[PDB]
Write a protein that binds this ligand. Structure first.
Ligand SMILES: CC(=O)C1=C(O)N2[C@H](C1=O)[C@H]1c3c[nH]c4cccc(c34)C[C@H]1C2(C)C
Ligand SMILES: [K+]
Ligand SMILES: [Mg+2]
Ligand SMILES: [Mg+2]
Length: 992
């Protein structure tokens, strides 16, 4: 049964045919057990490691390299037995990189924590029900509770299901709804029906929600919904939903893979049509099996040349080195790709309570009476500092520090706050911070007494635990509280009856009252001025409320409590405490002492972080569960709104948002910076609209209610003081709760993005140069210039060192002054594609020309034969036109090691040209990045180690170039820098 909050307790009881006294029977439970099942949150199992590694191989471009792995394994299977050691190097190093990138991709995207497990912690193991088989209350598992059961709930217990309240056994019933509402303040509940079925969970005072706990009181009720039907069940339904979101860089590289896969297939057929016919007259060079061996060797080389192997390594290396840089700022990155996404975020959604505010209530202001003249009175306004429950602070009067031991009106004010309290302060030894005991509102008064220190009690040489209650224990030794008049909804106040201890015969009993200002001071017939007592004037009572109104409804917008006392209370025996309605009569003729305002203070660095995101073009939108008045008040402090700014169309509540038509809801998500009284389902609903607009959203909650908005967001952020559910649902956690890490992570995320796309183009320009080299030798007919074994060493070891160093390029000075980049922007531009194509064509001709140089230059090699070079496959000894030259020169390492040195040297040049896009190398010196110069030296010296170390040149088929051949490769490769510089000059000084 749903929407039972609109129906009376008798109607709901009549729906299940149950008697609230005897509850359900055993035969009716079994009938309800079948249809509604057991009451629990089902668990969502995660994908295992065997399934995640398979999805790495399902990519289209991975299947291309995997295809070349099997072809090279068959090509190495047909090789002669003498060369077998060097033959299997190709398929193994291909399979080596194939498996290496497979596990790196899984280790990168894997989320090791499950949010459903943290959500199932709120399900209580046991519950208390009334059933027909027992005359009294029974205790059973929460799994066996079915809708229609009559349950009893007491203080401290967790609510096993969603329950319609029937009878409240205590005076008032208080609940902690922070699960759904995100707010830690207790809520008063009743049994009366609530109209307006569209009302949110915050507006239903007759319902108990599963996972919440009871702050105080005792009551009973009937279970409307169990299992997934509850409100916590609506949370996990949005938790199990995962769209496999991918960061924009992963999204474009995923598309670039299918765009590259079509080219590799077309280039294979492009060489196949230029392939001389082996079915007609290839001089019968081989058998029918030997005809397809060249097409397989050229396709493997085309795949190894086009596919940028090692790219998953340099990307993952940049993410891990960026995650470590963020951990030093106390930001724990739970998803490696998510450090890049935070650079392009155009909007930041933030929960107010626990994130923008300290979640700990503190007294902001207080006042007492100063002087009374006629019907007009003057007040002394005081302010109290500190954002936390830590009993530290100093009271200021009119912008001057003052000690309150000399104000007798303040001493009695602190007397009321300590003496009438159900709460206490506590110091956590493990957490190292002061926690709260009981109500957070009453705890704010406890801190005030310690921070005021009216009696000048010595606080030095006192333990941190003893310091919590230190100033309260003194007042407890003074006055003895005999009993307490419980808080009741009618009078909106409470009181305590205390008698002095030390002034036994010189003093008499008194009664201290606190409550809502309207209901209290109307029962106050006097005003406390210092230690004296003056009658309450209608002109005085009008001036008193004039201040309390400006505190509640003003730009401050603080909660207020009127503090009054009864000097001559009624006698002990004359008070019968069973009926709660008599308490408003017992508290009367009070003397108004003072009033104390309180607020949940915003965090210190939040207001400064908002101004920085505003300069970066990043909006901030508060989505909270608190009231609209308090939220707008916080937004004016932190800078989201202006003090005089009109919030009319810029702020909405939960029901107001749902009431709008879908066309009106769209406009709100764009222009509205504040959303209050928001159900957890609406937190994800707001973020869902921002994603429909092609915006990159960042959601920072601390709460269980924030979990849907966190999981739905592309990059979520969690507070270290937040619940475990909010941590497992996000990609990032702030351990120190510093909000300035958000603006520091956006700066760290933009520097990575500019460097990532920089080496992405460097590695992608190196591949097009290797395709032109392998396509030109196949069209001309020259022997192989580059072996795919050599290309893998160039793609991984040679080009991986400067590519990783390109991630260390110094960021921009104004980088945080730029608006967020377009998430749909291409990786390459029109002029950038023409440039990488022009550069790739020069290196392709430089490596092919290097092999043609050794043959045609006739220094150390044979003389120049062009017809014999393209036709070299037709060379067999005793054939004319080959007279004078050896037929084995085509397999010599010299032409290949000539092209390999040209390829490596050019890649050291392109690595140097990758410092800045359009800037020159003279105005941007090469030493601006030290890691890049060191990467070139290591990569260049590794090109020597591959030649000289004994086993290496046999598998790679290379030899040293001695003295002279290096001068040919250095003069041919160096113009790459001059050629690229010209393409940068016309783009910088002319194109734009
Ligand atoms: C087994 C494994 O997980 C993988 C791989 O083994 N790889 C990458 C890859 O995902 C491939 C890839 C997919 N999309 C792109 C864009 C740009 C570059 C690459 C890729 C490199 C690819 C390869 C083969 C290195
Ligand atoms: K998420
Ligand atoms: Mg992969
Ligand atoms: Mg919160």
């Amino acid at each position: 049964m749903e929407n039972a909050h609109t129906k009376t307790v008798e109607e709901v009881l009549g729906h299940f045919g149950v008697n609230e006294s005897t509850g359900l029977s055993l035969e009716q439970v079994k009938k309800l057990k079948e249809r509604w099942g057991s009451n629990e949150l089902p668990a969502e199992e995660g994908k295992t490691l065997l399934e995640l590694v398979i999805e790495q191989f399902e990519d289209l471009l991975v299947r291309i390299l995997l295809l070349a792995a099997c072809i090279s394994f068959v090509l190495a299977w047909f090789e002669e037995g003498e060369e077998t050691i060097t033959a299997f190097v190709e398929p193994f190093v291909i399979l080596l990189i194939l498996v290496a990138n497979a596990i790196v991709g899984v280790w990168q995207e894997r989320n090791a924590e499950n949010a459903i497990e943290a959500l199932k912690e709120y399900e209580p193991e046991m519950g208390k029900v009334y059933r027909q088989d027992r005359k009294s209350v029974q205790r059973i598992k929460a799994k066996d509770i079915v809708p229609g059961d009559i349950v009893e709930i007491a203080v401290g217990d967790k609510v096993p299901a969603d329950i319609r309240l029937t009878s409240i056994k205590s005076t008032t019933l208080r609940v902690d709804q922070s699960i759904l509402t995100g707010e830690s303040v207790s809520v008063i509940k009743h049994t009366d029906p609530v109209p307006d079925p569209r009302a949110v969970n915050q507006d239903k005072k007759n319902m108990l929600f599963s996972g919440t706990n009871i702050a105080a009181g005792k009551a009973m009720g009937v279970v409307v919904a169990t299992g997934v039907n509850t409100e916590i069940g609506k949370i996990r339904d949005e938790m199990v939903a995962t769209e496999q979101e991918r960061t924009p860089l992963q999204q474009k590289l995923d598309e670039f893979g299918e765009q590259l896969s079509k080219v590799i297939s077309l280039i294979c057929i492009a060489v196949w049509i230029i392939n001389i016919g082996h079915f007609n007259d290839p001089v019968h060079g081989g058998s029918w099996i030997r005809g397809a061996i060249y097409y397989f060797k050229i396709a493997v080389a085309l795949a190894v040349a086009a596919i940028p192997e090692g790219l998953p390594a340099v990307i993952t290396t940049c993410l891990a080195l960026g995650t470590r840089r963020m951990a030093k700022k106390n930001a724990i990155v739970r998803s490696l790709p998510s450090v890049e996404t935070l650079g392009c975020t155009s909007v930041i959604c933030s929960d107010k309570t626990g994130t923008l505010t300290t979640n700990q209530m503190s007294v902001c202001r207080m006042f007492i009476l100063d002087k009374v003249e006629g019907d007009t009175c003057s007040l002394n306004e005081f302010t109290i500092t500190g954002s936390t429950y830590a009993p530290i602070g100093e009271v200021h009067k009119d912008d001057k520090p003052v000690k309150c031991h000399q104000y007798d009106g303040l001493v009695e004010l602190a007397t009321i706050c300590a003496l009438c309290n159900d709460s206490a302060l506590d110091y956590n030894e493990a957490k190292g911070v002061y926690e709260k005991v009981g109500e957070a509102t009453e705890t704010a008064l406890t801190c005030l007494v310690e921070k005021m220190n009216v009696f000048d009690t010595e606080l030095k040489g006192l333990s941190k635990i003893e310091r919590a209650n230190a100033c309260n224990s003194v007042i407890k030794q003074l006055m003895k509280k005999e009993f307490t008049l419980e808080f009741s909804r009618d009078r909106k106040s409470m009181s305590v009856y205390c008698t002095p201890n030390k002034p036994s015969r010189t003093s008499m009993s008194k009664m201290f009252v606190k409550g809502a200002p309207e209901g209290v001071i109307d029962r106050c017939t006097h005003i406390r001025v210092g230690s004296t007592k003056v009658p309450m004037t209608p002109g005085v009572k009008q001036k008193i409320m004039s201040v309390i109104r400006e505190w509640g409804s003003g730009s401050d917008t603080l909660r207020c409590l009127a503090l009054a006392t009864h000097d001559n209370p009624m006698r002990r025996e004359e008070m019968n405490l069973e009926d709660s309605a008599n308490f408003i009569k017992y508290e009367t003729n009070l003397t108004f002492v003072g009033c104390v305002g309180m607020l949940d203070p915003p965090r210190i660095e939040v207001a400064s972080s908002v101004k920085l995101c505003r300069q970066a073009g990043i909006r901030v939108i508060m989505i909270t569960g608190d009231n609209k008045g308090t939220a707008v008040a916080i937004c004016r402090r932190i800078g989201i709104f202006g003090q005089d700014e009109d919030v009319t169309s810029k702020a909405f509540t939960g029901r107001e948002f749902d009431e709008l038509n879908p066309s009106a809801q769209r406009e709100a998500c764009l222009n509205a910076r504040c959303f209050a009284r928001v159900e957890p389902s609406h937190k994800s609903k707001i973020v869902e609209f921002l994603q429909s607009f092609d915006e990159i959203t960042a959601m920072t909650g601390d709460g269980v209610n924030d979990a849907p908005a966190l999981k739905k967001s592309e990059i979520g952020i969690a507070m270290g003081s937040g619940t475990a559910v909010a941590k497992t649902a996000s990609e990032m956690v702030l351990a120190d709760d510093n909000f300035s890490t958000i603006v520091a992570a956006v700066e760290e995320g933009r520097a990575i993005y500019n460097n990532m796309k920089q080496f992405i183009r460097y590695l992608i320009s190196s591949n097009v140069g290797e395709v032109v080299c392998i396509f030109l030798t196949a069209a001309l007919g020259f022997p192989e210039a580059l072996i795919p074994v050599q290309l893998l060493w160039v793609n991984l070891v040679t080009d991986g060192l400067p590519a990783t160093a390109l991630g260390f390029n110094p960021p921009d000075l104004d980088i945080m002054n730029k608006p967020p980049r377009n998430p749909k922007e291409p990786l390459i531009s029109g002029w950038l594609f023409f440039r990488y194509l022009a550069i790739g064509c020069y290196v392709g001709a430089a490596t092919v020309g290097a092999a043609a140089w050794w043959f045609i230059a006739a220094d150390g090699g044979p003389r120049v034969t062009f017809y014999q070079l393209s036709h070299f496959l037709q060379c067999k000894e005793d054939n004319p036109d080959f007279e004078g030259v050896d037929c084995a020169v085509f397999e010599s390492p010299y032409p290949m090691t000539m092209a390999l040195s040209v390829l490596v040297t050019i890649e050291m040049c392109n690595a140097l040209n990758s410092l800045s896009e359009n800037q020159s190398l003279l105005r941007m010196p090469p030493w601006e990045n030290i890691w890049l110069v060191g990467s070139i030296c290591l990569s260049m010296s590794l090109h020597f180690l591959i030649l000289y170390v004994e086993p290496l040149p046999l598998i790679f088929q290379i030899t040293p170039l001695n003295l002279t051949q290096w001068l040919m490769v250095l003069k041919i490769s160096l113009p790459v820098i001059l050629m690229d510089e010209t393409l940068k000059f016309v783009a910088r000084n002319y194109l734009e």
